[PDB]
Design an enzyme around this catalytic site. Structure first.
Site, PDB file in Angstrom:
ATOM      1  CE  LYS A 240      29.593  83.805  60.804  1.00  0.00           C
ATOM      2  NZ  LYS A 240      28.579  83.379  60.966  1.00  0.00           N
TER       3      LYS A 240
ATOM      4  CB  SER B 142      25.885  84.554  60.458  1.00  0.00           C
ATOM      5  OG  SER B 142      26.114  83.468  61.489  1.00  0.00           O
ATOM      6  CB  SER B 143      29.647  81.580  56.811  1.00  0.00           C
ATOM      7  OG  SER B 143      29.276  81.373  59.424  1.00  0.00           O
TER       8      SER B 143
ATOM      9  CB  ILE C 275      25.237  80.616  68.062  1.00  0.00           C
ATOM     10  CG1 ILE C 275      24.424  81.180  68.846  1.00  0.00           C
ATOM     11  CG2 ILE C 275      23.980  81.345  66.862  1.00  0.00           C
ATOM     12  CD1 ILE C 275      24.711  80.140  69.812  1.00  0.00           C
ATOM     13  N   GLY C 276      23.240  77.998  65.256  1.00  0.00           N
ATOM     14  CA  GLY C 276      21.697  77.876  64.680  1.00  0.00           C
ATOM     15  C   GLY C 276      22.193  77.800  63.959  1.00  0.00           C
ATOM     16  N   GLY C 277      22.489  77.525  62.766  1.00  0.00           N
ATOM     17  CA  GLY C 277      23.611  76.381  61.971  1.00  0.00           C
ATOM     18  C   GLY C 277      24.150  77.193  60.622  1.00  0.00           C
ATOM     19  CB  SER C 278      26.130  80.783  61.348  1.00  0.00           C
ATOM     20  OG  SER C 278      25.146  81.163  61.972  1.00  0.00           O
TER      21      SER C 278
END
Lengths: 549, 545
Positions: free
Chosen positions: B110, B185-186, B206-209
Site C-alpha cells: 500500500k 483504503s487498501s 483505522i476503520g476497515g481499510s
C-alpha cells in the site's frame, strides 16, 4: 462556584483515622493470640530470611503459612509505630491464608499493597476526602492474581494526597516517616511501601509509578524496586484521581528487599491468570534465560543529566558502580539521552497537565490541601492568561519555572494529538540514539539521599532523573549501592545547582543532615526488556552489595 | 489556487506511466529469455507451495518475480491499482537472504508503506515530489526475511474512505466488475491480489481499510491489534490520534499465506528494529489447534441492515461450524450505536478534523470522498445547530455530525476513558459467555463506484473493532447468487435515511461478486483469530486447502 467549607472533609478524616486505629488493634490482638499458642517460634530467625529461602521453606513444609504471616504482621505493627506507613489492615486476609493455593509460586508470602490497589470492601482514598466511605466492589486484577499464586495481601500502605507528589502525607491518614531518620521523607507516592518493606515489615510490596513513584520510595528507604514497561502488568482496577490520560504512561511493579525477589514477583504475575483476567495485557511470559544470563554487557552511563545537579553522594555512587562494572568485565560507554529539558518541561509536564490540571483539581473541591503538595494546587488553579503572563515574566530570569508553568495550561484536543505524536517521536529518537551506541542497558544516577519532610513538593526539578523514563516508557529499576559518608555531607555546602532558581535552593537545604542514609543507582533497559533490566540489576547488586546473594 | 494540484497530478501520472513502461520492458526481457518456463502453473500455485519450491531450488527467485510482475502489469490494465514500480527490487532480488522464510516472494505494498526513493502521496498534492529517504520498519524485515516488495498500490485520497480514487492516479476498479469499487483504503491491494497480481500484500486499517477491500475483491486479510506490528515509518494524515487504533496487516489469497507472513514478521528483526513492539512470537500451537471452539455470533448489528448475500453467508458458515462440533452462541456487543456515534466518530474527529483538513489546502476533493470535506469545513456552532435540528428525523446523521465538533484536551481524556471502559464492558460479556472467538457479518458485496463515501453508516461492522482494538480478519465464504441480488429489492434498512438509501442502490447488481465473513478474537490473540479463519475457510471453500 460557592464555597462548601471543610466540614465534610473533617468528618472523613476522623472516620479514616478510626479505621486506621481499628486495623492496628485487630493486628495486635491477632498476633498476641498467636504468641499465646506458639511461644516456641523464633521471630528474628524468620524475619531475617531472604524471600527466596522463605518461600521455599513454605513449600517444603519446614514453615507453616500461619507462622510467617503472624510474625510479619507483628513486625508490621511494630515498625508502624515509628513510621506511620499502614492505613488499613485487610480484614478478610485470614480466610485467604487457609484458601491459599499450595502450588502457587508465592504460597504463604505476606504481600503489602499501596492504597491505590483496590481490595473488596475497602476504601482507596488516595488521601482524598471525597473517596472515603466508598468501599471497592472487587479486588483489582493484580490482587486476584497474587491471591491465585498463594500470596496473602495483608495491608494498605500510605500515599501522599492524590499521589501526585514524591513525599508521603495526606489530610486523612497523616504523614509517613523514613525508618532511617524521623525528619526525612520515605519517598512517594509509594511511600508507605518504602517505610514498611525498608524496616523489615514486608518481604514484598506493590506500587505504581508515573513520575518516579516506585523508584523514589525505594531509593530513599534503602530497598529495591522495578518500574516495568507501562502495559507489562494489568492497570485494571487501580484507583487514580484522573482517568483517560495516555500521554505519560503509568505502570505498576514490585518493591522488595533484594532484586531476586523482584524477579520472583514478576514471574509470578506474568501468568495465564493475568492474561485471562485482563486480555489488554500482551501475553509476554517472564523470559528466564535472559534474566539468568551472565554475558558481558554494553552499559551506557552518565554522571549528570545536566538538569538536576547530583548530590556528591549520588555522583560518588554512580562512579563507584560504574568502576566496579568495568572491573567485572563489562564495557562502559558515556551516554546521555538527547534534549532532557524538552522531555520534562513540555513532554512530561504537558502530558500530565494537558487539561491544565482541571480534572485533577476536581478531587480537591471542599477538601484540605496537604502541605507536602507545596503550591501545586495554588499554581494549577490560576487562569490560563495568568499562567501565560507569569511564564513570560519568568522566562528571562528563571527558564525552568517558565516552561513548566506554560505547559500546565489547558490546550485543545488538536494540540494533544501533536503532543502524543511528539512523545512517540522522542521515544523513537532515544531508541535510535541507543542503537547507534549499540547499548544493551543504561546506568543513571538515582536522586538521593532522602529529602527533609515537606520539601519534595517544593523541588519539582528533582524528578528529572525518574520522569524521563515514564515519558520514554522504558523499564527502570532502582538498587541501593552505598550510604552517605561524612565527606559527602560536607560537600553539600559547595552545592550550587545548574540554574540557581528557587528549586535548587530548596533542594540544597533538603539533602543536608543526611549521614548514614542510603543512596541508590538506576538501571534502565529498552521497552519490554525488563528481564534484561533485572539481570543488569542483579549484577549491580552483586558487585555493590554481595551480601544479598 | 489550483496550479499546484494540476502540476502534482501531471507529474504523478508521468511517474506511473514510466513505472509501467519499466515493468513492461523488464517482463518482455525475461519472458523472451525464458520461454520454456510455465507461467500458468506458477501463478495458480498457493503461496505455501510456491515458497516450498523456492526453498528446494525447484523454482528460481528470478522465475517467480517476473512471472508475477507480468501478471501485475496485465491486471493493472483493467483495474488501475499499481501506483509505482519500486526499482530497487531487481537488485534486492539477487541479494535476498536464502535462510529467510519469505525467500523470493514478491510483496505488494500500500502506498503509505514508505519505500526509499519513492513518494507516499496518499492522493494529496502536498506529498507529491517528496520521496521517502528510508524504508519503513516492516519493509526492512520483509527484505531481511527474503521478501521482494515490487510495487506501490493505489489508495483513496487522504485514506479516510472505503472507496479508492484520488486526483493524482485516478480511480481503482474491482477486478470482478468494472462498475464496482474495490473497497479501501487498501483498494489497490484488493484489486491486485484479487486477480492474482500478487501472492501477498500489506495494508493499514483505522476503520476497515484491510477488511473492506478483502471482502469486496474476495481475498483474505487480517487486522491485528494496533501494536502487534511496527507502525514506524508509515505515512498518514493525522499523527497522535490514539483513541481509535490504527493497525497494519497482511492480505493474501488464503489464510495459510497470512499465517506465514505473520510468522515472518513476528521475528527477532522486527523486535530489534522496533523495541516499542511487544516481542510476542508467532504462537504456532494456537494457530494449528483443532480443539472445538465456543463461537459467538450475530447476523446483524441492528445498525446496518445486512444484505441478503451477507445474511446467507453468515448463517451458512454458522451451520457448518455447528456441523463440525463447534458450539455456537448468540452474542452481541452492547451499545453499538453509542460506540459508533460518540466513541468511534469522536475518536477520529476529536479536533473537528482540523488536522485532517490541512492536507486539503489548495487541493482537489475526489468525488469518492463525497460530502465529508465540506461537512468538516463547517463551523462547530453550525455543526451543533444542524445536529439537534436533524435529531428528531434522522438520529444517525445527527449524532455523527455532533461528534465531529472540536473538543478540549479535558474532553478527549473523558472520551479516551469511555473507550477504556467500553473495551472492558465488551470483554466482560465475552468472559460471561466464555467465548473463544466471534463470528460477524462483513459488509458486502462490493459497492458501486462513488457510493462508499455517501454510505458512512456501513463502517459499523468494521470500525467497532478498531474502537475495541481487537484482532479481526475476513475470509471469503460465498458468492452473490442472482437469488440474493433479487432480494435486495426488499431491503429497507433500520432508519431509512440517506445512508440506508445510498446503500440499497450501491449493493444492487452484484451477481457473482464475493461475499466474506468476519472473525474476531480478543486483543493479542491474532493466532487464535487465524485459527478460526482457517476453520471457516476449510469448511466453506475446502479447495483452498
Amino acid at each position: 462556584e460557592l464555597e462548601t467549607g471543610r466540614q465534610k472533609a473533617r468528618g472523613a478524616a476522623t472516620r479514616a483515622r478510626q479505621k486506621q486505629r481499628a486495623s492496628l488493634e485487630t493486628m495486635d490482638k491477632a498476633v498476641q493470640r498467636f504468641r499465646l499458642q506458639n511461644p516456641d517460634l523464633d521471630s528474628e530467625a524468620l524475619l531475617t530470611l531472604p524471600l527466596l529461602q522463605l518461600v521455599q521453606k513454605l513449600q517444603s513444609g519446614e514453615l507453616s503459612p500461619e507462622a510467617v504471616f503472624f510474625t510479619y504482621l507483628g513486625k508490621a505493627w511494630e515498625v508502624n509505630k515509628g513510621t506511620n506507613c499502614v492505613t488499613s489492615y485487610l480484614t478478610d486476609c485470614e480466610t485467604q491464608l487457609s484458601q491459599a493455593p499450595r502450588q502457587g509460586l508465592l504460597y504463604g508470602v505476606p504481600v503489602s499493597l499501596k492504597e491505590c490497589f483496590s481490595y473488596k470492601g475497602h476504601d482507596s482514598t488516595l488521601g482524598l476526602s471525597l473517596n472515603e466511605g466508598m468501599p471497592s466492589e472487587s479486588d483489582c486484577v493484580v490482587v486476584q492474581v497474587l491471591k491465585l499464586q498463594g500470596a496473602v495481601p495483608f495491608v494498605h500502605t500510605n500515599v501522599p494526597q492524590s499521589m501526585l507528589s514524591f513525599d508521603c502525607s495526606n489530610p486523612l491518614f497523616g504523614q509517613t516517616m523514613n525508618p532511617w531518620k524521623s525528619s526525612k521523607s520515605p519517598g512517594g507516592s509509594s511511600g508507605g511501601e518504602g517505610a514498611l518493606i525498608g524496616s523489615g515489615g514486608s518481604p514484598l510490596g506493590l506500587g505504581t509509578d508515573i513520575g518516579g513513584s516506585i523508584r523514589f520510595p525505594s531509593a530513599f528507604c534503602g530497598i529495591c524496586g522495578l518500574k516495568p514497561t507501562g502495559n507489562r502488568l494489568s492497570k485494571s482496577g487501580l484507583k487514580g484521581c484522573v482517568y483517560g490520560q495516555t500521554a505519560v504512561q503509568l505502570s505498576l511493579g514490585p518493591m522488595a528487599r533484594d532484586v531476586e525477589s523482584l524477579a520472583l514477583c514478576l514471574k509470578a504475575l506474568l501468568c495465564e491468570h493475568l492474561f485471562t483476567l485482563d486480555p489488554t495485557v500482551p501475553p509476554l511470559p517472564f523470559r528466564e534465560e535472559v534474566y539468568r544470563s551472565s554475558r558481558p554487557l554494553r552499559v551506557g552511563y552518565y554522571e549528570t543529566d545536566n538538569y538536576t545537579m547530583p548530590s556528591p553522594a549520588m555522583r560518588r555512587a554512580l562512579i563507584e558502580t560504574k568502576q566496579r562494572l568495568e572491573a567485572a568485565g563489562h564495557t562502559l560507554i558515556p551516554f546521555l539521552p538527547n534534549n532532557i529539558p524538552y522531555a520534562l518541561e513540555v513532554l512530561s509536564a504537558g502530558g500530565l497537565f494537558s487539561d491544565g490540571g482541571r480534572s485533577f483539581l476536581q478531587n480537591f473541591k471542599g477538601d484540605f490541601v496537604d502541605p507536602c503538595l507545596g503550591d501545586l494546587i495554588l499554581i494549577l488553579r490560576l487562569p490560563s492568561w495568568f499562567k501565560r503572563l507569569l511564564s513570560l515574566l519568568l522566562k528571562p530570569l528563571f527558564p525552568r519555572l517558565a516552561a513548566f508553568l506554560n505547559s500546565m495550561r489547558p490546550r485543545s484536543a488538536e494540540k494533544l494529538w501533536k503532543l502524543q505524536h511528539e512523545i512517540e517521536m522522542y521515544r523513537q529518537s532515544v531508541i535510535a540514539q541507543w542503537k547507534a551506541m549499540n547499548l544493551d542497558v543504561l546506568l543513571t544516577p538515582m536522586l538521593g539521599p532522602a529529602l527533609d519532610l515537606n520539601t519534595p513538593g517544593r523541588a519539582t526539578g528533582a524528578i528529572s532523573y525518574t520522569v524521563l523514563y515514564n515519558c520514554l516508557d522504558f523499564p527502570a529499576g532502582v538498587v541501593p549501592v552505598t550510604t552517605v559518608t561524612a565527606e559527602d555531607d560536607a560537600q553539600m555546602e559547595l552545592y550550587k545547582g545548574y540554574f540557581g532558581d528557587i528549586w535548587d535552593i530548596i533542594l540544597k537545604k533538603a539533602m543536608k543532615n543526611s549521614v548514614g542514609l542510603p543512596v541508590a543507582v538506576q538501571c534502565v533497559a529498552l521497552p519490554w526488556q525488563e528481564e534484561l533490566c533485572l539481570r543488569f540489576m542483579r549484577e549491580v547488586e552483586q558487585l555493590m552489595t554481595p551480601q544479598k546473594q
